[PDB]
Structures are given as C-alpha cells and as structure tokens.
Amino acid sequence: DNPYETDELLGQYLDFHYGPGHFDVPNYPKACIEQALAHHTGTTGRALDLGCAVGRSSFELARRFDEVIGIDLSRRFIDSATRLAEQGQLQYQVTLEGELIERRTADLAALELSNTAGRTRFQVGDACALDDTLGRFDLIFAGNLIDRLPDPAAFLAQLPALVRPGGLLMITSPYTLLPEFTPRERWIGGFERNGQPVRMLDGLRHHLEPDFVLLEPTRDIPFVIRETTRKYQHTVAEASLWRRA
Numbered sequence: 001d002n003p004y005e006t007d008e009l010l011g012q013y014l015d016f017h018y019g020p021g022h023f024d025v026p027n028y029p030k031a032c033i034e035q036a037l038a039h040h041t042g043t044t045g046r047a048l049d050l051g052c053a054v055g056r057s058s059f060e061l062a063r064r065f066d067e068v069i070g071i072d073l074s075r076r077f078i079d080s081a082t083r084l085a086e087q088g089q090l091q092y093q094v095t096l097e098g099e100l101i102e103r104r105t106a107d108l109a110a111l112e113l114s115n116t117a118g119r120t121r122f123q124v125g126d127a128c129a130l131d132d133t134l135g136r137f138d139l140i141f142a143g144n145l146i147d148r149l150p151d152p153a154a155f156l157a158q159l160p161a162l163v164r165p166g167g168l169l170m171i172t173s174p175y176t177l178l179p180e181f182t183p184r185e186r187w188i189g190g191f192e193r194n195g196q197p198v199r200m201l202d203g204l205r206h207h208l209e210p211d212f213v214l215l216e217p218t219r220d221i222p223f224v225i226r227e228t229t230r231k232y233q234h235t236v237a238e239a240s241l242w243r244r245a
C-alpha cells in the first residue's frame with residue numbers, strides 16, 4: 001500500500017538524494033541543510049531528520065552535528081540509508097524508457113560525506129507518533145514531509161517538547177495536499193474558513209507559535225525528481241525556519 005516501499009520510488013529517491021543534478025537545479029537535501037546550518041545559532045550536539053527517506057539530509061547534517069537521527073516510515077528507504085552509512089556506497093536501477101533500465105552507484109566518498117557517516121543512525125518510525133525515549137534536539141529538519149502525513153497537527157504537537165530552547169526547527173514543503181496522504185478534515189491549511197483563506201503557513205503558525213518564533217521571511221527552495229530519461233518533477237518548496245523560545 002505504501003508507495004515509498006516500492007522499487008519505483010527507491011530509484012527516484014536514490015537518484016534524487018545521491019545522483020547528478022538536472023536542469024542545473026542544486027541537490028535539494030543538501031540545499032535544505034545549507035539553509036538550516038546558516039541559521040542555527042545553538043549548540044551542535046544533536047539533530048533529528050524526520051521523513052529522512054534515503055538519508056542525504058542526514059549525512060549533510062552529520063558534517064556539523066555530533067549525532068544525527070534519521071527517521072522514516074519506509075523500511076526499504078531506511079535499509080538503503082543504513083547500507084550507505086555502513087558500506088559507504090550502494091547500487092540501484094533507474095528507468096530509462098519502459099522496461100529499459102540502467103544501473104547506477106550512490107557513493108558517500110564522492111560527495112565528501114563518508115568521514116561523518118558514523119555520526120548517523122537511521123530507524124523506521126512514525127513521525128506522527130514518535131517514541132517517548134527520543135530525547136530532545138538542538139535542530140530538527142522535516143523535508144517535504146508535512147504534506148505526506150495523515151495527522152499534521154499531531155506531528156506538530158510534539159515539536160515544542162522536542163526542540164531545546166534556542167534550537168532551530170526547519171520545515172519545507174510544496175504543500176501538495178492530497179486525500180491519499182492527508183484526510184481533508186485533518187488539513188491545517190489550503191482552504192477557506194469563515195470565508196477567508198487559511199494557507200498552510202498560517203496553519204503552521206497557529207500550531208507552532210509562540211513556542212516557536214518564525215524567522216522571517218520564508219524562502220523558496222526548488223527541486224527536480226527524475227522519473228525516466230525524459231520525465232521529471234520540478235517543484236518549488238517553501239522553507240520555514242522557527243526558533244524555539
């Protein structure tokens with residue numbers, strides 16, 4: 001039932017996280033973490049990467065944080081991230097055209113990520129119901145996650161307790177709201193209420209303030225996902241950075 005446990009998605013996401021770029025758009029997980037690191041003014045002991053997929057943002061965070069925990073619900077994704085952490089490389093297939101496929105390599109050494117791979121730990125888990133043993137963090141990253149969760153409010157309700165005061169929360173999303181992933185009654189934005197628009201960002205503020213303070217302004221970060229030799233997604237996420245009060 002989970003698309004994120006399929007070979008189709010594995011090949012998209014291993015290319016997206018570790019492959020060459022497309023249309024001269026920079027690697028997206030790396031671009032996201034560059035922005036988080038440019039704004040984090042706290043200590044660098046511990047970061048949490050929620051919805052980490054096959055782990056590029058977690059390895060990027062590990063260049064600066066002593067410990068990085070990456071959590072994703074997809075076991076196929078997490079098994080790839082762990083293999084990269086432990087062996088430094090893996091191979092995968094991408095679609096060329098129809099059934100014609102091509103084998104490719106992901107390599108942490110080539111990306112200058114192998115030296116700190118030991119600072120990562122990857123686990124399967126549900127971001128809407130995180131273990132109560134997880135502790136708290138100096139920095140939390142949730143990339144392209146909130147529009148893929150069935151209970152966004154339940155996810156957000158954990159975050160004040162998960163971030164130390166003075167720490168940083170970074171959420172990015174293109175707000176691709178879909179009933180397949182979020183029941184309409186659980187949307188926190190993307191609709192009209194009492195005849196006025198409620199944007200997803202308004203929903204984020206309602207749930208996070210004043211425990212977090214939004215660093216203004218929000219920023220657009222684009223990304224490209226390769227599906228075949230010829231077909232790509234090209235999308236503009238909104239990044240919002242939040243300081244814990």
Ligand SMILES: Nc1ncnc2c1ncn2[C@@H]1O[C@H](CSCC[C@H](N)C(=O)O)[C@@H](O)[C@H]1O
Pocket residue numbers: 004016029050051052053054071072073074077125126127128142143144145148149150
């Ligand atoms: N309940 C849940 N708990 C944890 N991860 C979840 C989840 N529902 C979906 N996900 C994960 O959220 C991700 C959405 S796509 C974004 C992946 C990655 N952060 C990137 O920016 O490229 C997928 O990896 C999916 O497996």
Ligand SMILES: N[C@@H](Cc1[nH]cnc1[SeH])C(=O)O
Pocket residue numbers: 144145147148174175176225233235
């Ligand atoms: N289309 C991709 C990228 C993404 N992630 C969250 N929203 C979007 Se659009 C996916 O569904 O994983």
